[PDB]
């Protein structure tokens, strides 16, 4: 479910955040996405 | 079998600085 504040537990990454569609360019071997200040930014859905 | 290769190198613990493109490709690296 998207477009709502939802408690996620993606593959062991517990947290609370709004989830939506994005236009990243995740390469085939990539799973996580982080920033310069090292915060988990974009997560490739394991079953999507 | 048949009827300009073998470039072997050893790795060591080094700090590297890598430049990531806007697409996640590693376009450059500089040793430290």
């Amino acid at each position: 479910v998207k477009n709502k504040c939802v408690n996620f537990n993606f593959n062991g990454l517990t947290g609370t955040g709004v989830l939506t569609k994005s236009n990243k360019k995740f390469l085939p071997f990539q799973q996580f996405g982080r920033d310069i200040v090292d915060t988990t930014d974009a997560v490739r859905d394991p079953q999507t | 079998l048949n009827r300009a290769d073998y470039y072997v190198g050893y790795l060591q613990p080094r700090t590297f600085l890598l430049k990531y493109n806007e697409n996640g490709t590693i376009t450059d690296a500089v040793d430290c």
Partner: peptide
Amino acid sequence: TTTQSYTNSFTRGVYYPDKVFRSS
């Protein structure tokens, strides 16, 4: 057989350390 000539690596031999997508 083989030879043991020596060359330079230059800017070479660099793989992705972890699996984190990164941009800019």
